[PDB]
């Protein structure tokens, strides 16, 4: 399924993911497109920072959900 | 019309605004009520940072809409 990741610079990234993918899996997919290391990425959804070890499903992230990305 | 402006600290203030008010006008009303100068305010609605030069109606901000305020 597709989700969106929006930056404060105005970019909208798309990722193909599964509900069981982990946050680090997501950050690696961002790295693959943007070159930003996962440890420089803060992902936000529903007013919460997303944590390593958890899945998208843990946060109720569903099809065409939008995450926000800020860089360290 | 009344709108609400909330911060991440949980405070919610009420403002009287018009559909044709510009974002900079709304920031001037926040300054009038809370004393926060406009260059310290970032206003957010429906996943966008509101841009000066546009009106509330341009963003489909309606009666009793809630905007988020982040202070810089």
């Amino acid at each position: 399924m597709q989700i969106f990741v929006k930056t404060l610079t105005g970019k909208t990234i798309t990722l193909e993911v599964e509900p069981s993918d982990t946050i680090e899996n997501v950050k690696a997919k961002i790295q693959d497109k943007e070159g930003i290391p996962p440890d420089q990425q803060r992902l936000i959804f529903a007013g919460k920072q997303l944590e390593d070890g958890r899945t998208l499903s843990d946060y109720n992230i569903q099809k065409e959900s939008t995450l926000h990305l800020v860089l360290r | 019309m009344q709108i609400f402006v909330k911060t991440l600290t949980g405070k919610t203030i009420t403002l009287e605004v018009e559909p044709s008010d510009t974002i900079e006008n709304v920031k001037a009303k926040i300054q009038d009520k809370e004393g926060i100068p406009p260059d310290q305010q970032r206003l957010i609605f429906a996943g966008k940072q509101l841009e000066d030069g546009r009106t509330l109606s341009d963003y489909n901000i309606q009666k009793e809409s809630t905007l988020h305020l982040v202070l810089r």
């Binding site: 803060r42 936000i44 007013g47 800020v70 | 957010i44 905007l67 988020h68 982040v70």
Partner: peptide
């Protein structure tokens, strides 16, 4: 710091959406 401000901006954007 800019980082803290950006985190707050992202939290608010995210909240305002969903």
């Amino acid at each position: 710091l800019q980082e803290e401000e950006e985190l707050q901006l992202a939290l608010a954007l995210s909240q305002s959406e969903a």
